[PDB]
């Protein structure tokens, strides 16, 4: 049944890391992946970066392409062994969501799959520690709440920012509307995805602002100027899969170019977008102009801003 | 409006509230905010030169003037002389004046409260231009007179390109020339640039007959005392430029009013009328000048007389 199908997919995703060890003696064996085979397993997967997204898209397509559900499980099984795990979860979730063989197949809860992202390192290693400390079938319970000096008032917001449900939602939303989404390949299109992109994020900000006010704090200010230094934040999250953790950032240093992109380019893209909004039209690749219609305008802008594959340019 | 924005105006606003951009401290804006006050701040010039530069770039794109455009054939300017106490010297001094506060601020018991101030002023003078009309018939000419500084910040260098920025318009008027030699005399008082008189609320309390037009009436026009620069005690040297152009070309035809506010046409224009001169404002100075020296620029219907302006302490 579909629920038996659940019970197989969930242990497919259960403990991702250790299901790596590719264990296929010849690299050529998976010609199916000869186009990709660029981002190693341990590395962190970026939802935002273009190259990462490209790989992810390639993966999904294979999953979509799978002739039947059984075939789907097979390629997935074997692909997981070789690809980076984060990318894998991303690609599979997208496949499960869209591919007709999958109704009533929920995914493994993200929080549950990667508990380390949801809870602090201290309650990750305490719990791991208790497991090792005394072997026993008995259950282990750890209270994540901690005790600490709470120097920054931003801490007050933590109930909102840190909330497990909120983070999970954000993960899922991107899955339903992937930036990489190519309507031609799937054949189906996501209605008003660009606009939805705008709306969902706007709501998150709006909701956030209500928290600050509830707190007695002023509304958040936009990061208009690229030059300004950022406030620091330390996540205290570990990635068990490796030793590594998300790097913390202290405050007070202006913005640095990456090899991939320079800040100046970011500024450009903004002036570009503003102009288009201003003259009420955007330029397509064809160099034709499309009007920012009342009906269409938000959607077109959303695709360009994010930007999705859908971006006109 | 949306694409291009409003650069000039915003400049005034931004400079005006530099002290309290954010508006938190609740302070009034500076002088830049008001048309009445803005000239007093030295910043005004810096900004306006900036904007002027924008116009200049546009002017730069235009081609220069040929002899054809400049010259008025058959007419030759023999010489110009300025008559004052001492010929070719204009004297400038400071004069005391009083302003009556009573209309503006609550007077109470007092009949009048006057504040005494001092301003720059100059002796009256006249111009005598000798022109030879080679043609058989009477011609109509527009006489254009400008003043430009001889000296630079380095040493004496009449580089016409630079001069263009400096040249100030003394006067523009129509004169008819008969064949043969002609002498045209004009008095400084007649100057088209300046306002002959502004009636005080007291004069207005009675009822005079300059005629009855409005906000420009006595108000607009450049002030008379201001007509020439201060100069120095030494007697600074200025180039006096007189040019005659074909009036038939210069004027527009149409049907407008009685003699109305036209004294001050050079800077103000005419009431409910088209600007009376076809030539670009600032002609011949508006376009780039190829020549190294101003003298080289001169055509036969142009002339330069060096005069001195000496201030009296």
From Swiss-Prot, chain A:
Q: Which GO terms describe its cellular component?
A: extracellular region
Q: Does the keyword S-adenosyl-L-methionine apply?
A: no
Which chain regions cross the lipid bilayer?
Answer: none
Principal cellular location given in the protein's record: secreted
Location in or out of the cell = Secreted, Extracellular space
Residues bound to Cu cation 1 are 170, 174, 201
Q: Which UniProt keywords apply?
A: Copper, Disulfide bond, Metal-binding, Oxygen transport, Phosphoprotein, Secreted, Transport
Molecular functions (GO terms): chloride ion binding; copper ion binding; oxidoreductase activity; oxygen carrier activity
Tissue specificity note? Hemolymph.
Phosphoprotein keyword on record: yes
Output the PTM entry: Three disulfide bonds are present.
Q: How does it assemble?
A: Scorpion hemocyanin is a 24-chain polymer with 8 different chains identified, assembled in hexameric substructures.
- Role according to the record: Hemocyanins are copper-containing oxygen carriers occurring freely dissolved in the hemolymph of many mollusks and arthropods.
Family recorded in the similarity comment: Belongs to the tyrosinase family. Hemocyanin subfamily.
Instruction: Recite the other comments.
Output: The two copper ions bound each have 3 nitrogen ligands (presumably contributed by His residues) and share a bridging ligand (possibly contributed by a Tyr residue) in addition to binding oxygen.
- Name listed for the protein in its UniProt record: Hemocyanin AA6 chain
Organism of origin is Androctonus australis (Sahara scorpion)
